[PDB]
Amino acid sequence: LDPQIVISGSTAAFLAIGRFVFLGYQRREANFDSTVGPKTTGATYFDDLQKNSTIFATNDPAGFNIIDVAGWGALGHAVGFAVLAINSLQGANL
Amino acid sequence: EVGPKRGSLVKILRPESYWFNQVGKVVSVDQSGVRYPVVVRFENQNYAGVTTNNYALDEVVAA
Amino acid sequence: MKDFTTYLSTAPVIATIWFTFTAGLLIEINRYFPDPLVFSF
Amino acid sequence: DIAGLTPCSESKAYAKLEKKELKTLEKRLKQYEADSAPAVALKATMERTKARFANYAKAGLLCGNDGLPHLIADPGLALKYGHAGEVFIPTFGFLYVAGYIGYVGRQYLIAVKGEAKPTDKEIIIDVPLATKLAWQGAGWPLAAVQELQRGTLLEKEENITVSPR
Amino acid sequence: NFGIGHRMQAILEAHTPPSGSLGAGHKGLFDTVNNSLHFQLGLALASVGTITSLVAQHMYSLPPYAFQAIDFTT
Amino acid sequence: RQSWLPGSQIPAHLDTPAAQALAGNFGFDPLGLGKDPVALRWYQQAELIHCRTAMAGVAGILIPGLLTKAGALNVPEWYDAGKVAIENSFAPWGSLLAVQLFLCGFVEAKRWQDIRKPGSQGEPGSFLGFEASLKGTSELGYPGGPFDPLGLSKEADKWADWKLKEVKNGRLAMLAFLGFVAQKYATGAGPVDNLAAHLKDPWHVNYATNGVSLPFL
Amino acid sequence: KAGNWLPGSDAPAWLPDDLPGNYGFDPLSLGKEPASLKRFTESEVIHGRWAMLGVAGSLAVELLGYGNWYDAPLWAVNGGKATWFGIEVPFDLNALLAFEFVAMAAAEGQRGDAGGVVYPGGAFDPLGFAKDSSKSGELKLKEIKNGRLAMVAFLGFVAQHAATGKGPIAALGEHLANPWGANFATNGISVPFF
Amino acid sequence: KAGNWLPGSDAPAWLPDDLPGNYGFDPLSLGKEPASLKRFTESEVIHGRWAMLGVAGSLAVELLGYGNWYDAPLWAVNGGKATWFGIEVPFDLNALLAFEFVAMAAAEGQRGDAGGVVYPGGAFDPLGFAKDSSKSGELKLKEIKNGRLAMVAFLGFVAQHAATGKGPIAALGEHLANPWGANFATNGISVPFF
Amino acid sequence: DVMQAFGTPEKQILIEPVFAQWIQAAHGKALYGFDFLLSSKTSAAFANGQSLWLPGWLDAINNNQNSLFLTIGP
Ligand code: CLA
Ligand code: CLA
Ligand SMILES: CC(/C=C/C=C(C)/C=C/[C@@]12O[C@]1(C)C[C@@H](O)CC2(C)C)=C\C=C\C=C(C)\C=C\C=C(C)\C=C\[C@@]12O[C@]1(C)C[C@@H](O)CC2(C)C
Ligand SMILES: CC(/C=C/C=C(C)/C=C/[C@@]12O[C@]1(C)C[C@@H](O)CC2(C)C)=C\C=C\C=C(C)\C=C\C=C(C)\C=C\[C@@]12O[C@]1(C)C[C@@H](O)CC2(C)C
Ligand SMILES: CC(/C=C/C=C(C)/C=C/[C@@]12O[C@]1(C)C[C@@H](O)CC2(C)C)=C\C=C\C=C(C)\C=C\C=C(C)\C=C\[C@@]12O[C@]1(C)C[C@@H](O)CC2(C)C
Ligand SMILES: CC1=C(/C=C/C(C)=C/C=C/C(C)=C/C=C/C=C(C)/C=C/C=C(C)/C=C/C2=C(C)CCCC2(C)C)C(C)(C)CCC1
Ligand SMILES: CC1=C(/C=C/C(C)=C/C=C/C(C)=C/C=C/C=C(C)/C=C/C=C(C)/C=C/C2=C(C)CCCC2(C)C)C(C)(C)CCC1
Ligand SMILES: CCCCCCCCCCCCO[C@H]1O[C@H](CO)[C@@H](O[C@H]2O[C@H](CO)[C@@H](O)[C@H](O)[C@H]2O)[C@H](O)[C@H]1O
């Protein structure tokens, strides 16, 4: 069953459809700074824990940082392990 | 002149009033520039037993 | 006897008469058709 | 055979209950003479009991393990297995009469709203008007539907409301 | 702070049905819930009581603990 | 005035010009069901459909009943003819009822939409030219055209009496079907056999001498 | 405005006449809002194209002898060795499931990023039949009507199978063998009282 | 205006005299609307041409000895091997059914796209008999009258077979053998009691 | 109460809870004979669970000595 094949393929497919397919949609959706403004305008330490203290710059041209990577690879690992587990009991219901 | 006539039916648009959205008969409108000149008599009394109350020109509407 | 029949038209007298009537109707229905658990007739 | 319920004609607990009630009544009957007033009363009670049991078993009622008739409220199970006279038919039988009462009272209220003192026509009933409306309220469903379709059954936003709407 | 995820204000202000069947919908409700501790507390007590009743209804039908359901007093 | 109760106070809604045009207006509305003019229009339509359906059905009951009492036919009793006809049929009664409900719902929905807006099924392009003949006439319930082959509605001299004959025979036939039902449930015999048994002994064979109609008597 | 759907019923005011397939059928008033109506106009054509393909496939798989549409996916369960036109295909359920996810994700994301696009001429109109003309409107009407018919037909596939257990062509043969003893009324499902 | 259909009955005002076959027969007033009347005028000639061909065929199949019109389609059922003039034809029911669908679809679509066309001279008038002249009107009248007669005759075929079970020529022979013992009144179908 | 007082308990209104009993039979209680979803040994819901929780669930819910979906009546 080659779990390396399965999980590498799931992660690669999800990273691909996150980079090439659903990146524009996710950027259109995640741009909430709108009526929906910042959580805090204050200068307290606890107001700073809610600000984006570190913008994750990426030299990827489409803007695919370690957070997009983390998310799409997490979905890929989850789906690959789902495939492996549903194959683990050598069958499915219907 | 101001206010409905002295026998007209008038509907109340004051929310805190017992007769909100209820039709009462106008008794008198004070032509003096006073707050709440319209006197409206109602055929059903409120919780205090009162059948009339004073209403402004904003708080009354025809029919 | 306009006033007497006005009295008999009062809420308590009319209620008494009407509920005597309804109860008697139900009682006679239950005497002539006893124990009606279901509508089968 | 709806929910494990056996017909009361085939249940043995039902017959046991019948003979138990009859045994109670005849143990009361043994105390009196042949044709006493109590004897007549108890014989009539025994006849009513036997008739009641026969008429419940004849009506296709379903019985439990206790031998007591159980009613089927569900339409679809009542109409599939012939138990519509238990809850389904008397449902509309009741609703007819209840809408009768409500429609008649409604029409009386609306008719006396026009008088100069509508309140004294409610503590002192206008009996001729009330009887007219009680007789002509037999067609309450049709009249109610036609009053619903004209938009005249409901009042619009002329009803009164508290300050926070 | 990592750039991904939802803002509850967006979810709430987006869920306005057409046909105006709920009017403005859930517009202005994030502020109402987040600024009122009694709204939060009522939601929390509602959920907690419902799941306490769930606990009660499920621990007797599906006894999770060994030699429970033979300890009747328990 | 031609009232149902010569001394009654006729309801005011049946004395209006819009109601006195209706066929068979004898002031009978003791329950006030047609006090609403729209309801009166709808119920006039219901009366006409019930009356024509009942006329057709009661004819199909007692004409073949009289002809099988006279030997010209062997049609079973109307309360037996469904079983007999379905045991000689090509189809189960379920498929029959389905086809019937489709074919009847079509024409009854057309009639419905013509009641909702009179003269609306003549919207050009709806049918294949036949919608031209589906506008009806000035009077609702009296469609005419293809429903009037012999052209008896084109007089304006026999029209009121044609209406009256229809509605009166139809009320009579509705009563006749109710009587078929009650007589079957109270006697167990056919309507023509009930007539025969009444005509052989009227004073001891009637609804007063069956055990159903008057339990107190 | 092509048709009325209810002769005599005057059309709703929110359905434009230029809309392909407008018969005035909106009794629930679902398309009263213009944005809702635009989304519904796209989704109707999409559902209809997918249903046309689906009915074509469910009919071609049975008319050619490879079973019915319902029994085709029982190679994943009940063994394996998918087939197409009899040619067995070297893909198990997981591989083609994942490839379908990937491919349809790419395709429908390219379609969704286009906003509301229902008639994308060009790469999807190579033979040049629709250029927003008289023929284009007529062909849009034809497309949407065949799509509505195919949607009804697939709903019929599903219902007839859930009631009878047969295939579309098998049920058609049953009906032609006994039009009155084999219909929706004669199964013990559709009309229960029958 | 050729004939009256009811001597004394004055003609309906919606039936033009220039219409071939106008006897003033519209008692149901079906052709009161001009568009309805145009559709009906085309459909009458179409039904009539089809009925002329159909009666000619039902008579030629029995006068030549190949059975009646009703029993001809019982090769599809009850076996196979269609025949024509005795020549067996290599087509089963499905093949010729599909080819008939295709061919008649093409033909009648070409006819319907023409709008209302009932007299298409040219490719359908090679011998040049009708050029919208005196002869053309007279021949249109002849066509529509023979078509009405053939429609009546095919309705007669169907009714006489449903009542008797015989063919047209067989029923004609029965009637000529016993004009009074073999007619519509002597079967136990047409007249209800006898 | 009045019927048991008058010694005629067969005149009681004993409405069988057929909706909750139908639900119970959908979970595999074969006491009522509805044979709907998991009490139906031919359904897909029943077939797809047999490699899974359903053997134990159906041995536990049809045991009338536990409190898993007790038998109910009027
Ligand atoms: C809301 C709860 C409830 C319900 C549903 C019932 C239901 C019933 N009870 Mg119970 N009961 C209740 C509360 C309730 N009761 C209470 C609170 C008490 C204590 C006071 C009792 C004490 C009690 C006793 C002691 C008895 C009952 C009985 C009955 C049955 C009555 C059958 C009957 O009378 O047929 C009546 C049938 C009708 C068709 C009447 C309908 C009304 C009219 C007539 C219909 C209209 C016809 C027509 C249109 C009229 C034209 C106009 C007219 C003026 C001519 C029925 C099963 C009796 C029984 O046998 O139970 C098994 C019985 O003996 N009950
Ligand atoms: C439509 C007219 C009509 C006619 C001609 C008949 C005729 C007959 N019925 Mg039927 N019947 C009818 C309507 C009719 N019925 C209706 C509407 C009902 C339901 C209430 C019944 C219920 C009924 C029962 C339960 C029984 C009969 C019986 C009979 C027979 C004896 C008469 C009798 O007992 O009183 C008939 C009973 C009535 C309650 C009178 C209803 C008559 C209505 C109001 C219309 C006719 C009145 C009209 C002004 C005068 C006659 C019209 C006529 C010239 C057409 C007789 C053949 C009996 C039978 O079978 O004996 C062999 C019997 O047991 N009928
Ligand atoms: C449609 C109808 C009968 C139709 C019969 C049909 C199709 C019969 C069909 C068949 O038999 C055959 C042909 C052959 C059989 O083998 C098969 C069947 C199928 C069985 C009867 C309506 C019958 C309708 C009836 C009897 C209606 C009576 C209504 C009355 C009396 C109303 C009275 C009032 O409403 C007013 C008028 C005014 C108010 O103010 C006062 C009150 C009093 C309320
Ligand atoms: C029926 C349907 C929609 C019906 C909608 C209706 C009636 C809507 C009606 C209304 O909303 C309007 C219009 C206006 C409102 O005011 C009123 C109502 C009444 C509310 C959609 C079907 C839509 C159906 C679709 C999209 C079908 C697609 C099918 C496919 C892809 C099939 C694939 C396969 O069959 C093959 C090819 C081979 C097999 O082996 C494998 C599988 C996968 C099974
Ligand atoms: C009777 C008929 C139409 C009759 C219409 C009439 C009376 C209309 C009358 C009215 O409308 C008017 C005028 C005016 C209105 O105001 C009044 C009425 C009264 C309403 C049409 C038949 C129309 C008949 C037609 C079209 C027949 C076509 C037949 C064909 C094709 C036969 C083919 C075959 O027989 C062969 C060749 C060989 C076999 O083996 C196979 C088959 C297939 C069986
Ligand atoms: C250089 C470059 C490249 C490449 C790159 C790469 C290759 C990257 C990768 C990346 C990656 C490779 C990533 C990954 C990620 C991953 C992740 C992120 C994971 C996660 C996981 C998780 C989350 C888990 C979970 C879980 C567990 C723990 C267990 C079981 C259950 C579950 C599954 C749930 C190219 C050529 C394109 C070009 C450009 C640049
Ligand atoms: C006053 C107020 C308040 C409070 C309120 C409350 C308290 C409420 C409550 C509420 C509640 C307390 C609710 C509940 C609910 C419930 C529900 C809603 C349920 C549901 C269910 C479902 C949906 C199910 C499903 C299913 C089933 C049926 C079974 C099996 C499984 C499944 C899943 C399938 C607040 C603060 C807000 C503020 C405002 C005011
Ligand atoms: C039947 C079995 C298969 C089920 C289908 C699975 C669908 C799950 C969708 C997940 C991805 C959603 O994204 C996909 O749909 C969105 C609309 O809903 C599209 O969103 C689009 O329409 C929105 C309308 O305001 C706008 O944001 C943009 O025009 C556009 O982004 C995305 O451009 C598309 O990429």
Curated annotation (Swiss-Prot), chain A:
Disulfide bonding pattern of the chain: none
Keywords, ordered alphabetically: Chloroplast, Membrane, Photosynthesis, Photosystem I, Plastid, Thylakoid, Transit peptide, Transmembrane, Transmembrane helix
Superkingdom of source: Eukaryota
Record organism: Chlamydomonas reinhardtii (Chlamydomonas smithii)
Compartments it resides in: Plastid, Chloroplast thylakoid membrane
Transmembrane parts of this sequence: 5-25, 66-86
Full-length numbering of the shown residues: 32 to 125 of 126
Membrane topology according to the record: Multi-pass membrane protein
Coiled coil: none
Name of the protein: Photosystem I reaction center subunit V, chloroplastic
Cellular component terms (Gene Ontology): chloroplast thylakoid membrane; photosystem I
GO process annotations (BP): photosynthesis
Role, per record: Not yet known.
Similarity annotation: Belongs to the PsaG/PsaK family.
From Swiss-Prot, chain B:
Topology versus the membrane: Peripheral membrane protein
Keyword Membrane: yes
GO BP terms, alphabetized: photosynthesis
Any GO CC annotation of this UniProt entry: photosystem I reaction center
Compartments (UniProt record): Plastid, Chloroplast thylakoid membrane
Keyword terms, alphabetized: Chloroplast, Membrane, Photosynthesis, Photosystem I, Plastid, Thylakoid, Transit peptide
Role description: Stabilizes the interaction between PsaC and the PSI core, assists the docking of the ferredoxin to PSI and interacts with ferredoxin-NADP oxidoreductase.
Subunit structure: Interacts with ALB3.1, which is essential for its insertion into thylakoid membrane.
Family recorded in the similarity comment: Belongs to the PsaE family.
Protein name: Photosystem I reaction center subunit IV, chloroplastic
Organism expressing this protein natively: Chlamydomonas reinhardtii (Chlamydomonas smithii)
Source species taxonomy: Eukaryota, Viridiplantae, Chlorophyta, core chlorophytes, Chlorophyceae
Gene encoding the protein: PSAE
UniProtKB/Swiss-Prot annotation, chain D:
Record's signal peptide: none
Compartments (UniProt record): Plastid, Chloroplast thylakoid lumen
Keywords: Chloroplast, Photosynthesis, Photosystem I, Plastid, Thylakoid, Transit peptide
Major localisation: plastid
Recorded GO CC terms: chloroplast thylakoid lumen; photosystem I reaction center
Coiled-coil blocks: none
Gene Ontology biological-process annotations: photosynthesis
Entry function: Probably participates in efficiency of electron transfer from plastocyanin to P700 (or cytochrome c553 in algae and cyanobacteria). This plastocyanin-docking protein contributes to the specific association of plastocyanin to PSI.
Family named by the database record: Belongs to the PsaF family.
Descriptive protein name: Photosystem I reaction center subunit III, chloroplastic
Organism encoding this protein: Chlamydomonas reinhardtii
Biological classification of the source: Eukaryota, Viridiplantae, Chlorophyta, core chlorophytes, Chlorophyceae
Name of the coding gene: PSAF
Range within the parent protein: 63 to 227 of 227
Curated annotation (Swiss-Prot), chain I:
Compartment list: Plastid, Chloroplast thylakoid membrane
Lineage: superkingdom: Eukaryota
Subunit architecture: The PsaA/B heterodimer binds the P700 chlorophyll special pair and subsequent electron acceptors. PSI consists of a core antenna complex that captures photons, and an electron transfer chain that converts photonic excitation into a charge separation. The eukaryotic PSI reaction center is composed of at least 11 subunits.
Function noted in UniProt: PsaA and PsaB bind P700, the primary electron donor of photosystem I (PSI), as well as the electron acceptors A0, A1 and FX. PSI is a plastocyanin/cytochrome c6-ferredoxin oxidoreductase, converting photonic excitation into a charge separation, which transfers an electron from the donor P700 chlorophyll pair to the spectroscopically characterized acceptors A0, A1, FX, FA and FB in turn. Oxidized P700 is reduced on the lumenal side of the thylakoid membrane by plastocyanin or cytochrome c6. Both potential cofactor branches in PSI seem to be active; however, electron transfer seems to proceed preferentially down the path including the phylloquinone bound by PsaA.
Family: Belongs to the PsaA/PsaB family.
Record protein name field: Photosystem I P700 chlorophyll a apoprotein A2
Species whose genome carries this gene: Chlamydomonas reinhardtii
Residue window of the full protein shown: 442 to 515 of 735
